Write a protein that binds this ligand. Structure first.
Ligand SMILES: O=c1ccn([C@@H]2O[C@H](COP(=O)(O)O)[C@@H](O)[C@H]2O)c(=O)[nH]1
Ligand SMILES: O=c1ccn([C@@H]2O[C@H](COP(=O)(O)O)[C@@H](O)[C@H]2O)c(=O)[nH]1
Lengths: 257, 257
């Protein structure tokens, strides 16, 4: 009894951010998250505008932008609202609770002010989530927990992955899903987002490993693919995004029956 | 056959950054790292100047400064050189190698340009270290691997800690030690730095747990204590730093015999 994205958006325990995401995924027929791994604000914004209709989400690493300002993020929000996608800052909070609350709200990035979603590693224990909650719940935000990683030698396996699932399921007022390589929770309220995705087999020279959209959405049961270089390094990023969108969407439909 | 800090500084396999640190620890009779967990540049710099003579290291979270600029970090370097301490940015890199190299070199913080030391979580596998190396080795920097954490529910235990030790010992041209609660490596070339330290028993409301300097240096065999609020929240931060310095230094001497 797998439910569609649109039906999952109505589940009793769904988080509002998850519901908004699932609705726009269904409406736009996209389960693609662009990993906008660029150093120039203009390139980030030009990609967001052109690829916005093709994506459910844009994932940032703002600490790599050479020309970050809060006004860049205001412009990104305008595009996210226009084209209907969520903004996910891939910050990987991974400190004690008291520290991560300050890293989320403050400093020069003010992440909580513009990011719909952030993520956290579970290695510190649940205080990492408690600390982020304290900022994120008043700001109506959501969080993803890193249950698995795509890179060679990842230690996010076995009991570590199980601990991430338990932590998410016990902080469901803020945690909306996972970064994972596969479905890790049996609860349909949670979102599974999978990086390490390309159409062709391979990897990079620093431990990244790729699997295809069909493999990770269809056979591994994930919801959303996160794609960086497979799009970003292509000449025509729009065409590349459409290839990935169609691959991930069909894989989802074919598992739904 | 425990060696003094000064003798460890001469070990055949010692990393130059570790040697510099061990020498100044011995010279100044300090194994205290100040965790300068403040939001104002002026407070950071005033603490660095006043407490510089008492510390071997100043640990930053630059992403919490409200008024970060690269010129603040130039001023911090002047103080580090004057008073002889290393600068450790507690960034907790925790992404795939290709991403962390950009996060270390680039963006608005340009961490590698001013931080003697950074740290990394081992959860992504060794590509996290490979990626950071690529920036840090040309810049003559060092790295600490997070082998244990002080917070309640930490998953950095057992085989995870052992994996961190193996990863460090296989990347010894860049990795100089650990964030840990105790001695985790038997190789004296590696430094052990321990947060979660206060003179009194207790914790915080977000999962931090404290142990005393005597416990973590004397009984658990660590080298350096990392102290934030036990100093920062005190009225007289200089007196507080001296209390912690004397505690950690005596605990070291008494284990040395
Ligand atoms: O397990 C993980 C978690 C996160 N990312 C992130 O997802 C993107 C993958 O990019 P690419 O390999 O598709 O270019 C990068 O931003 C990277 O930091 C991974 O690749 N793997
Ligand atoms: O396992 C760890 C790793 C790092 N820190 C860091 O060390 C400092 C501890 O501060 P305090 O509890 O002494 O104020 C903080 O900056 C925190 O982010 C910990 O407390 N525990």
């Amino acid at each position: 009894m797998e439910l569609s994205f649109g039906a999952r958006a109505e589940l009793p325990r769904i988080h509002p951010v998850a519901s908004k995401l699932l609705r726009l995924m269904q409406k736009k027929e996209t389960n693609l998250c662009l990993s906008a791994d660029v150093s120039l604000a203009r390139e980030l914004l030009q990609l967001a505008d052109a690829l916005g209709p093709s994506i459910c989400m844009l994932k940032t690493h703002v600490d790599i932008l050479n020309d970050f300002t809060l006004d860049v993020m205001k412009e990104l929000i305008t595009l996210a609202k226009c084209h209907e996608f969520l903004i996910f800052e891939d910050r990987k909070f991974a400190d004690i609770g008291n520290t991560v609350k300050k890293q989320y709200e403050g400093g020069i990035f003010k992440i909580a002010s513009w990011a719909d979603l952030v993520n956290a590693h579970v290695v510190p224990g649940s205080g990492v989530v408690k600390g982020l909650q304290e900022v994120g719940l008043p700001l109506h935000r959501g969080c993803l927990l890193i249950a698995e990683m795509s890179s060679t030698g990842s230690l996010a396996t076995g009991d570590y992955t199980r601990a991430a699932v338990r932590m998410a399921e016990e902080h469901s007022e803020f945690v909306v899903g996972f970064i994972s390589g596969s479905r890790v929770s049996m609860k349909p309220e949670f979102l599974h987002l999978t990086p390490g995705v390309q159409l062709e087999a391979g990897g990079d020279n620093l431990g990244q490993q790729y699997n295809s959209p069909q493999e990770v959405i269809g056979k591994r049961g994930s919801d959303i693919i996160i794609v960086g270089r497979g799009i970003i390094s292509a000449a025509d990023r729009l065409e590349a995004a459409e290839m990935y969108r169609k691959a991930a969407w069909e894989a989802y439909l074919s598992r739904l029956g």
